[PDB]
Symmetry: C4
Subunit: 252 residues, 4 copies
């Protein structure tokens, strides 16, 4: 089964970036403003994407993003049956990567607020794994940020992949995709890292429900959990239209 081989590569790729990325957030969150700021969170996530792509680049294409996989299906570059397989493989591996981080910081997480796990607040530990609405990050505000963030990510990715353009040698394509993740995190109002990945958000959030935080991770922030899963999907369609009209449809 050729499809089975590519699912394993996608599962391992998302495991690397989530474990390396969410682990960096834990150091900043748990050690309050001592072991780093926001630049280290965005730098770690950006570099972890480069390593994740390099590990699984030659097997499954190194999408590691349901929005990226959706865009390729929308452009008929890949079969439509590769979306359910990749999405399942990408979510399983962000769940496993988040489980590793919980094992490493088990003692510090439980002692953040005494002996009780708090989903949201001043001493909130659930923000290590999944994004949450801040003071100026309402659903109407949050939906716009992820739409623009994913649209810019798709535009840059489609430029490198484009067969009409000269084939970029292997090695420099991975760094370019990791550069978009770093710039997007610095620009858009999201201090969690790689906020435009549906699989990086649902997986760790699903783990947080069974880790001990309860079901309040799904019924808080005015049911915010579905926003980082639907809006990134829409931005992938917009990014395809933006790129094709300006550049793609006229290349030869």
């Amino acid at each position: 089964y050729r499809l089975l081989r590519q699912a394993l590569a996608e599962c391992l790729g998302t495991l690397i970036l989530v474990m390396f990325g969410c682990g960096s957030v834990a150091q900043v969150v748990l050690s309050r403003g001592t072991h780093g700021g926001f630049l280290t969170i965005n730098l770690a996530f950006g570099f972890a994407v480069t390593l994740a792509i390099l590990v699984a680049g030659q097997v499954s294409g190194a999408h590691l993003n349901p929005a990226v996989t959706f865009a390729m299906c929308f452009l008929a570059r890949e079969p439509w049956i590769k979306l359910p397989i990749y999405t399942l493989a990408q979510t399983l591996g962000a769940f496993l990567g988040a489980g590793i981080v919980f094992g490493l910081y088990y003692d510090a997480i439980w002692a953040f607020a005494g002996n009780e796990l708090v989903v949201s607040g001043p001493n909130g530990t659930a923000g290590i794994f999944a994004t949450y609405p801040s003071g100026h990050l309402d659903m109407v505000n949050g939906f716009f940020d992820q739409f623009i963030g994913t649209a810019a990510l798709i535009v840059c990715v489609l430029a490198i992949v484009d067969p009409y353009n000269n084939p970029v040698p292997r090695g420099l394509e991975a760094f370019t995709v990791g550069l978009v993740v770093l710039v997007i995190g610095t620009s858009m109002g999201f201090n969690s890292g790689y906020a435009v990945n549906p699989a990086r958000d649902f997986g760790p959030r699903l783990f947080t429900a069974l880790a001990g935080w309860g079901s309040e991770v799904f019924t808080t922030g005015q049911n915010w959990w579905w926003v980082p899963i639907v809006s990134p999907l829409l931005g992938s369609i917009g990014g395809v239209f933006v790129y094709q009209l300006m550049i793609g449809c006229h290349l030869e």
Copy 2:
């Protein structure tokens, strides 16, 4: 054909302005909490690399009216491209600053209550365009843009020089973004890519119509014209410097 290349210049300049100006908004609105000047220069330096890779294979990825002027001076490109690319670069820096305002509309208005102030402690107009500082008046600021733009042109010309060994695709993009980051850290401008006439005037024109009024044009003793003339003069100066020392002797 010229319409296809002009479309890639608008999208390329939209990427760097939207990415670069978003980082400046984070620092200004969150005073000394989300980072400092290192993140502003790093984001602008990296956004230039992404813009060049997106539109490099179509139009050449100038993204700078000073760079386009220098290319036309050496007869590398037809002189008709200078007005075409300048319009394409300015229109797209105007649009790139419109997305940034949309992202931070609620935070920008609440910075000084419920009104927009051009300059001062609670000044939100400096996110999009550069304004004089205490030690950065018109006379002082004129020479910073002249020297900064000449340094950018000298470094760029060595990269795209056909006499030298051809550079692999992508590697050229990163080092052009290196110059942007280094110039920002060296010269006394804390906004990023302060040597681009299109990135400066484009967002500045938006703020005039966005609600800041015409005070953005009559502040700092009418500073708005300096970020346009000075980089244009610096590009000519940097062309002579490269041709005298390295250019004309390359054979």
Copy 3:
């Protein structure tokens, strides 16, 4: 004797890595919160690996790690005789690299606590060279960070050196390995730099015993000194199985 030439390049490679890395740790520790934080420590160690690999890559293969060398031998890629030779060459050079750092910072190190050398505590200078347990980094907790960190390092290394994949050009394999070192330090709870290298730990620790810190560097932390050696060796086996199960055995 080709084996003699390969051992010399390993000693020089580890000398570059330890001297450049421990020098930044000494700069940060001695100037308490004045010359930067842990971002400089991880960046200096990450970039030092790139230089070390570039210098000795074409002679010894640029292992610079007893755990990485163990993984190659376990995969039947290199003879088992190369393991004892490289391990001694890697340890000798971390011992020498730490000696240069002591010479450069002789006056500043002794002035930390007046005219005395203290292994650990507030005025502790022995943590510049080796790694010591923290409050949340006990023997049980600290063991798994080395196992998890080394497994991730082995997986990334194995992916970029696989013969069945596209041969990565020279000068980009060095950068990729340096990226792993920088990311691992940022994510995992070790603020010393390249904590997943057995030679980087045993070498400098053996130096501090003879430099004047005494034998207390071995008896402190309930005999912690053997953890940074055994655990990365075990993680190399675990890292080999993880990569071979998902990607290694399904390449052909």
Copy 4:
């Protein structure tokens, strides 16, 4: 408009290359020094200096080999890879360009530098502004301690440079050799005890120091720190010899 002489084209490339790194590198130092703890720490000083060397090598790489360092040219001639006549031509073309590079920096920050201490230019101290261009001893950086840092710093730089340039090795693609050399500058500044950037360059040290003598600071820049001025010139020269022997014995001599 053709020089048509190889020894003169290379000298002009060394002057423009060293002008780029000194102007770009010292500008970041001026921002950090003048704005006390506001525009960044020591990471930006070493990051900008590391990237400035990368840009300078790409500009002059194909014309003169992009040494931009009298210690690198000294090591190249020591191995009989270049004629000995290039040492005075390159050193003069490297010191000239660091002098002009520091002239631009003083022009841009003229108002801030003069107002730093009032209306006088103090070489060293609390309100010191002469450290932007040159390097001066710190509290624990006496003449003996300072000498050792320059020797180890230059020895490590030559070893890394010799590995990339090595003809017997695989030819590194153009544009990546420049990046590796800029990496060494960034790591050396962070590791060794020098918060000025690229402190192992004889041309980057004497040039801006000589300009400081005429700019208004005076001749105290030469007689301060127990005549510290000659150390950043002689010790890197000795370190380059040590770096050559370290690389040749361990790697170079055994390559066939």
